[PDB]
Amino acid sequence: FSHPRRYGKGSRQCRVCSSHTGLIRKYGLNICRQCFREKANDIGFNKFR
Amino acid sequence: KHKKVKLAVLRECSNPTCGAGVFLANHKDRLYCGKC
Amino acid sequence: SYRGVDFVKLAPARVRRRFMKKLRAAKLAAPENEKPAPVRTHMRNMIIVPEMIGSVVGIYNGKAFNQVEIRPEMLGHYLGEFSITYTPVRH
Amino acid sequence: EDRNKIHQYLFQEGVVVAKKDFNQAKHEEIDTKNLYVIKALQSLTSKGYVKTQFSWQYYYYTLTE
Amino acid sequence: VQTFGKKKSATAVAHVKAGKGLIKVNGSPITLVEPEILRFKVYEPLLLVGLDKFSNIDIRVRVTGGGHVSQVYAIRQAIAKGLVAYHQKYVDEQSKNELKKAFTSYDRTLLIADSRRPEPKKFGGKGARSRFQKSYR
Amino acid sequence: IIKIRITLTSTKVKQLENVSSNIVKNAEQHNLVKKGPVRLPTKVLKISTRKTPNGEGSKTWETYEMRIHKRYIDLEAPVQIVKRITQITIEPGVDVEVVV
Amino acid sequence: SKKRKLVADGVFYAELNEFFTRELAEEGYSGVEVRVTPTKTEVIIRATRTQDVLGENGRRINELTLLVQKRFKYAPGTIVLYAERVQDRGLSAVAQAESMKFKLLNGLAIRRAAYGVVRYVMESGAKGCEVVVSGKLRAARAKAMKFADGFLIHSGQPVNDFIDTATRHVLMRQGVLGIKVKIMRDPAKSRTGPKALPDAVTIIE
RNA sequence: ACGGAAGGGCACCACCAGGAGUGGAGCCUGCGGCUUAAUUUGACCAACACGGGGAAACUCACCAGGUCCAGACACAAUAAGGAUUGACAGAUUGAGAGCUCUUUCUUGAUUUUGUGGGUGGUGGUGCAUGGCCGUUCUUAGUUGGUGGAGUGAUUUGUCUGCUUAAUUGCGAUAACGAACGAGACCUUAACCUACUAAAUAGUGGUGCUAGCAUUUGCUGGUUAUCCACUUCUUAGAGGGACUAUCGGUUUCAAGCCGAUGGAAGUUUGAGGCAAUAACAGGUCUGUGAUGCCCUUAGACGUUCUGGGCCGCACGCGCGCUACACUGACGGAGCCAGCGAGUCUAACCUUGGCCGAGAGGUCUUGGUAAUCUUGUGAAACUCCGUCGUGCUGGGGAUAGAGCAUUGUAAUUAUUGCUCUUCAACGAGGAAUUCCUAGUAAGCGCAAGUCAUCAGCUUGCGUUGAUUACGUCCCUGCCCUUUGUACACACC
Ligand SMILES: [Mg+2]
Ligand SMILES: [Mg+2]
Ligand SMILES: [Mg+2]
Ligand SMILES: [Mg+2]
Ligand SMILES: [Zn+2]
Ligand SMILES: [Zn+2]
């Protein structure tokens, strides 16, 4: 009922929406690129320049 | 489509966890019980 | 023949980096002087070694299992190399 | 026992947190299948005694009166 | 006594001390700067004021951080600033002003660091202002 | 007395500097020896992403920034001063690590 | 590491904020303050009314603490919750958005709710409020209505300094309604940071 | 609103003067078409290296097949001496799959069968929606209160003139006083021998100390070996520019033009933020955002195997590599900056060793201003070989072998070695971007990432020519004007 999912896009998902595409893995966020835009201010990422 | 024929109203081996309810099925040389 | 002549120590890099038992039970369970009954498989990534020679394998290319007889010159090649996965386009 | 462990944990502890992984063999705290936990508290949903919230695929369940 | 020179990112720190006319750039003599074509850019802050002019000062530079040409300009500014600073601190303000006159009258950023810095790159095209090729159909 | 080093990390510059000045003041009030607060440079955790949640429009990119400033302050103090200095700086937002 | 650690702390704050937004919506939740202390980590739930978050002599706050600890893998006792009544809760954009969403959900005219929240915000010291209700406000064309009182700035750093915005999705029988609440607090009663607009000059004789 | 209408201003998504080119070649990549079992799909200035879309499996949504319910909960009939669950061995099946069968064991009210009623759906509808983003629109524009003008839609305020990047101001004035946008603001890049403070940054004077030279110098070493300092570096608090001063020009002024001084005189350079109205712009394939419709046990849920998304008469867009001597190739010289990196663990890897290379192996440092790393980058520079010929330019196509990542490289993942050495001799009509540390050339780090850059986001290295204008082309803003336009000249 399962085949290996230790790497590639199927190994990891967005921690918020569980989407496998558009994931941001920098610094270990593991948050979709859209969910990160939605809740970036909460994490502490701001726009300065 | 597993039907589980009713199996209407009704030995011993290793792995002593079997509590006298492990009667083997005898088709031919079938030393293997329902549990294992 | 092969490169001079298991039989993997005299083989290219991929096949040695990688390193159906019913094939023999389909080989001998039939009269001689004809080809063995086909053995069907999905494993296109299986390498042909000099033990399945002379057998008949139905390789899955996604549908409509393709019938291939194993020849001595197929050694070192993948089973999928002989079951084309698409249709020629005729352009 | 399959649901007895789940009910015992639910009562003794008071709440439950279950990650939304329907193939994780071992729940973090309860020694049962994660799917078993999720389906047990789904049975224990508004039919009675449990309120569930999702909050990033984690299934917070809490007991009611 | 301690001065520095920059062009884009290369900083050259020069130490000007009491000695006898020793001009080192990276441990090697100033004859060894090795652009092999801008070696006169590093001689320029010497030949302007006084060819020898010096049995009294020793200049020892150390440059890092830019490129070959930027380092050449950085050290050529650093040793000029070091000479000016040494003359201001130790010898006299009159001489300091008098050779600052020659340096600034021939100025090729000998005393003033160039303020040109790499402008940040913007999205939608490589480079700060160059944009990706646009098509319509 | 023991050698200690306090490492302070934060995104809030005002909180970080307030805590660092509190530590410096508590050291000078007892006249201890300390190597001044060294400012480990801001790590700008830049993250570039695409503004649109789809693939339509002018390709507008958007950079978010997370500034991590660090300070370190090492001194000598007995166990009492060490415990009171780790228990005097609980400003919200500054992470404090004390090493011997 | 430390970069990853701070990023994960922000992610944990976002997790807590959305969890409490979903759970304590009926409680007038406004925002968490996370304060990591060497002995324990304390999360303070800022709510307009902080009696339902406590529940029956701490039952609700205790179960919320237990849920948070069990989810974020804390040690029993290591994490503790609190609850604070928000001072001048008419200036909380999240609270006002939640209240207007509750009114629209239980059944009330869009104009009536938007003007109610606008009046409440303006009378609680605010120098400006704007409520935008987008969606199928009527049958099928999904227009957007704006309701504004007072002043409102849009461009610059003072938008981060003193402007509070909140967006909520309202679930009625025909599609979703987007509520946006924008509140500009008075810079004079700031109590932190700059106390006036950058362009404001006050002269004394 | 529009005008092949007029006045004024503007803009390298316009031009002029030019640079680099693109269009021509090979290849990469996306799109269409064709093909297919499927070649999933959205999108047609403001689609086409876009969906962060570099897809072997997964991703996946497509195709050929095979499992499972993860159908809550409520009612009845199967059932409380058995409703149902699982099964090893063979048939069947890619399958070591109890799928189904040959078959008789096993478990135990946890589920089966009808009925509702749920749940899931990358199913449909973006022309039902939220949110977000893009665009109109890079411009300077927008709005009300009271007053004035109109029967009224409306108008004035919000303007002749001058000025500004600016509805920026001087002013003018049936308007007055205001709000938003602009500006102000914030971030960053420039300087500061000023303060604070630094074996996680550095520099000197002594120690210890190899070399060369010996009146004591030069360059080197001394990660717990000594002291002092903060020029370089770092980052806190601040300073600094305000067009300052001086001339000239300014209708009276707002301003403008030069020169000096200045680190910096264009809004100091670059950004971030960014109004009112909108579009049937895109996204239901980001979302446990979602209404409605469809599906829901031979499923359009979900999972497993295999294939496809890449498939090739052709056309198009973004690009990489070139056509060579301002060069290719060999040695030698040996200069960055932005960054990232593993404690449940395999990440960035120094050093030693083996290998021709790719790489392998034994350690090591680093959770990081500490180590990788001074990222000893490339273009570049020096000295040589080549000698202008499809040449030693160019490296497509292909053959053979060696490895690495991965459960799995076949339709070559990629890297390495040898061999084959295509077009291409500077590109038609057309057409793009760009004004100073910019164009262009050059590489580097990050993102996606197990592996895979010809992509993007940033970074630095080398660093031009031309212009300092204009409204001719394409458009934009304001005013006047005409309209038989209002879906607004498509
Ligand atoms: Mg602004
Ligand atoms: Mg008007
Ligand atoms: Mg594709
Ligand atoms: Mg016409
Ligand atoms: Zn996401
Ligand atoms: Zn047994």
From Swiss-Prot, chain C:
Set out the biological process GO terms recorded for this chain's protein: cytoplasmic translation; ribosomal small subunit assembly; ribosomal subunit export from nucleus
Record keywords, A-Z: Acetylation, Cytoplasm, Isopeptide bond, Ribonucleoprotein, Ribosomal protein, Ribosome biogenesis, Ubl conjugation
Q: Name one GO molecular function term.
A: RNA binding
Membrane spanning segments where? none
- Lineage: superkingdom: Eukaryota
Q: Does the keyword RNA-binding apply?
A: no
Residues joined by cross-link Glycyl lysine isopeptide (Lys-Gly) (interchain with G-Cter in ubiquitin) = K9, K27
GO CC annotation: cytoplasm; cytosol; cytosolic small ribosomal subunit
**Subcellular location per the Swiss-Prot or TrEMBL entry:** Cytoplasm
Q: Where mainly found?
A: cytoplasm
Quaternary organization: Component of the small ribosomal subunit (SSU). Mature yeast ribosomes consist of a small (40S) and a large (60S) subunit. The 40S small subunit contains 1 molecule of ribosomal RNA (18S rRNA) and 33 different proteins (encoded by 57 genes). The large 60S subunit contains 3 rRNA molecules (25S, 5.8S and 5S rRNA) and 46 different proteins (encoded by 81 genes).
What is the stated purpose of this protein? Component of the ribosome, a large ribonucleoprotein complex responsible for the synthesis of proteins in the cell. The small ribosomal subunit (SSU) binds messenger RNAs (mRNAs) and translates the encoded message by selecting cognate aminoacyl-transfer RNA (tRNA) molecules. The large subunit (LSU) contains the ribosomal catalytic site termed the peptidyl transferase center (PTC), which catalyzes the formation of peptide bonds, thereby polymerizing the amino acids delivered by tRNAs into a polypeptide chain.
The family note in this entry says: Belongs to the universal ribosomal protein uS19 family.
Name-wise, this protein is: Small ribosomal subunit protein uS19
Q: Which gene encodes it?
A: RPS15
From Swiss-Prot, chain D:
Q: Which GO terms describe its biological process?
A: cellular response to amino acid starvation; cytoplasmic translation; positive regulation of protein kinase activity; ribosomal subunit export from nucleus
Identify the species of origin.
Saccharomyces cerevisiae (strain ATCC 204508 / S288c) (Baker's yeast)
**Gene Ontology MF, one:** structural constituent of ribosome
In the record, what lineage is assigned to the organism producing the protein? Eukaryota, Fungi, Dikarya, Ascomycota, Saccharomycotina
Task: Indicate where this protein resides in the cell.
Answer: Cytoplasm
| Protein name as catalogued | Small ribosomal subunit protein eS10A
* One CC-aspect GO term: cytosol
Q: Which domain of life is it from?
A: Eukaryota
Which UniProt key words apply to this protein?
Cytoplasm, Ribonucleoprotein, Ribosomal protein
> What's the stated role of this polypeptide?
Component of the ribosome, a large ribonucleoprotein complex responsible for the synthesis of proteins in the cell. The small ribosomal subunit (SSU) binds messenger RNAs (mRNAs) and translates the encoded message by selecting cognate aminoacyl-transfer RNA (tRNA) molecules. The large subunit (LSU) contains the ribosomal catalytic site termed the peptidyl transferase center (PTC), which catalyzes the formation of peptide bonds, thereby polymerizing the amino acids delivered by tRNAs into a polypeptide chain.
From Swiss-Prot, chain E:
Q: What is this protein called?
A: Small ribosomal subunit protein uS9A
GO function term, MF aspect, one: RNA binding
Subcellular location(s): the record lists: Cytoplasm
What organism is recorded for this protein?
A: Saccharomyces cerevisiae (strain ATCC 204508 / S288c)
Cellular component (GO) terms are:
90S preribosome; cytosol; cytosolic small ribosomal subunit
Q: Which residues form a coiled coil?
A: none
For this chain, the family text in UniProt reads: Belongs to the universal ribosomal protein uS9 family.
Task: Please note every region of biased composition (Basic residues).
Answer: 128-137
Question: Extra info from the record?
Answer: Present with 33800 molecules/cell in log phase SD medium. There are 2 genes for uS9 in yeast.
Short name of one Pfam family for this protein?
Ribosomal_S9
Query: What PANTHER family does UniProt report for this protein, alphabetically?
Result: RIBOSOMAL PROTEIN S16, RIBOSOMAL PROTEIN S9
